[PDB]
């Protein structure tokens, strides 16, 4: 088993391409209310799943929901791709503002694993170019995560490592 230590009051930032298994992971390890996803926040703005003008407002809504939860001292998991630095930066700022530890959990899986899961999804799919781009962005993000302000950086390098994770909420 791979034991990942997280403080009782953390902002757990999931980082991974579409299809990397973020939401599945979040569901397996955390309570439903602890998880705030970008899909959920987009849904608050538009019942139209494919509306792109909504993304900006949806990020604002996600950041604000996270802020209020953390302000209440409630461990929160951000279930979004988070492969761009510009997406991670305000999350880290939020964590610092409410004196929480930002934790990075990176789904460092090969692009082919993500592409294959995507092809087999029955809930919703993305285009292949999206996952190609996400994976490149994820890879380029890894080295710099600690310096970005993540207090603990956990890189999961394979599906088996992902599957072996157990969180320890000691601190």
Ligand X SMILES: Nc1nc2c(ncn2[C@@H]2O[C@H](COP(=O)(O)OP(=O)(O)OP(=O)(O)O)[C@@H](O)[C@H]2O)c(=O)[nH]1
Does 162 contact ligand X by CB under 6 A?
yes
By beta-carbon proximity to a second copy, the closer residue of 45 and 142 is 142
Residues 112-151 as x/- pattern, contact with ligand X by CB under 6 A: -----x--xx----x-------------------------
Cβ at position 170, least distance to Mg ion in Å:
27
Residue 19 interacts with ligand X (CB under 6 A): yes or no: yes
Q: Which pairing describes strands 35-37 and 10-15: parallel, antiparallel, or unpaired?
A: unpaired
- Is residue 82 a contact residue for ligand X (CB under 6 A)? no
Q: What are phi and psi of 41, to 5 degrees?
A: -65, -35
CB of 79: closest distance to Mg ion in angstroms? 6
Q: Pick the piece of the chain touching a second copy (CB under 8 A) from 11-19, 65-73, 87-95, 154-162.
A: 154-162
Contacts with a second copy, 129-148, as mask; x by CB under 8 A: --------------x--xx-
Which residues sit in the known binding site for dATP? 18-24, 121, 124
């Amino acid at each position: 088993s791979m034991k990942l230590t997280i403080p009782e009051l953390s902002l757990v930032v999931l980082i991974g391409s579409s299809g990397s298994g973020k939401s599945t992971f979040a569901k397996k390890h955390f309570k439903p209310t602890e998880v705030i996803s970008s899909d959920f926040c987009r849904g608050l703005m538009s019942d139209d799943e494919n509306d792109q003008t909504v993304t900006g407002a949806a990020f604002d809504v996600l950041h604000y929901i996270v802020s209020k939860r953390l302000q209440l001292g409630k461990l929160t998991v951000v279930d979004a791709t988070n492969v761009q630095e510009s997406a991670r930066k305000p999350l880290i700022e939020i964590a610092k503002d409410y004196h929480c530890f930002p934790v990075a959990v990176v789904f460092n899986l090969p692009e082919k694993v993500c592409q294959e899961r995507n092809k087999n999804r029955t809930d919703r799919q993305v285009e292949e170019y999206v996952i190609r781009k996400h994976t490149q962005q994820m890879k380029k993000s890894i080295k710099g995560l600690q310096r970005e302000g993540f207090r603990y950086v956990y890189i999961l390098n394979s599906p088996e490592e992902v599957e072996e994770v157990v969180f320890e909420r000691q601190p």
